[PDB]
Amino acid sequence: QYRIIDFKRDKDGIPGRVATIEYDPNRSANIALINYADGEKRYIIAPKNLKVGMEIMSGPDADIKIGNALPLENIPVGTLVHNIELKPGRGGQLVRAAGTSAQVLGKEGKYVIVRLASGEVRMILGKCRATVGEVG
């Protein structure tokens, strides 16, 4: 039932478990309490189909599953993503908790090409992070 949503998703390597999923009218969105193995607790926007009991992870080594956050360079072409970082570190700036998820279309050099819901296409630094899944 809480206030701060983690849009940074920087607990890399530390496995978390989806404890609960609840609707926040104030945010017109589902939010999940994640219990990390180091005892830390955080809330994130719950993507479509995320479920209690599922495991979560962030970083270069996380698998490609909804709720997981990884640098775009590590995300497979065709993946739907949200909470997209524009400059490596600034955290999610695009489609953080509402709208329609973007889709990775291709990877070239030190950039990943993404198609926003509107059809708009952007090339973004591979080091920039995104969370796998669909929102709003």
Side-chain angles (χ1 to χ4, degrees), residues 2-116:
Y2 231 51
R3 314 174 166 173
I4 338 309
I5 305 314
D6 176 13
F7 295 113
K8 269 178 196 172
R9 295 302 297 286
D10 60 353
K11 279 195 72 71
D12 296 355
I14 306 165
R17 183 183 122 90
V18 178
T20 62
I21 296 177
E22 40 199 45
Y23 183 77
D24 183 350
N26 199 229
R27 291 193 167 95
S28 44
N30 289 330
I31 66 175
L33 162 67
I34 312 300
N35 290 318
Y36 289 92
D38 60 14
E40 187 171 346
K41 295 169 147 214
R42 299 188 185 185
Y43 281 92
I44 64 173
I45 301 303
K48 192 184 179 80
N49 297 318
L50 182 66
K51 302 191 176 302
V52 163
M54 277 180 75
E55 292 174 358
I56 295 312
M57 202 174 0
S58 64
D61 309 307
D63 38 339
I64 311 307
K65 55 197 298 290
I66 76 168
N68 277 15
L70 323 74
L72 281 162
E73 52 179 26
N74 296 128
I75 303 173
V77 163
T79 309
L80 291 174
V81 301
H82 60 286
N83 191 45
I84 315 171
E85 255 187 352
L86 287 177
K87 288 184 306 180
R90 205 173 193 178
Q93 287 179 60
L94 288 187
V95 42
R96 314 204 312 165
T100 299
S101 278
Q103 178 172 50
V104 180
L105 301 176
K107 293 185 187 161
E108 203 155 294
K110 72 164 188 178
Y111 292 90
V112 162
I113 306 162
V114 173
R115 177 166 178 285
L116 308 192

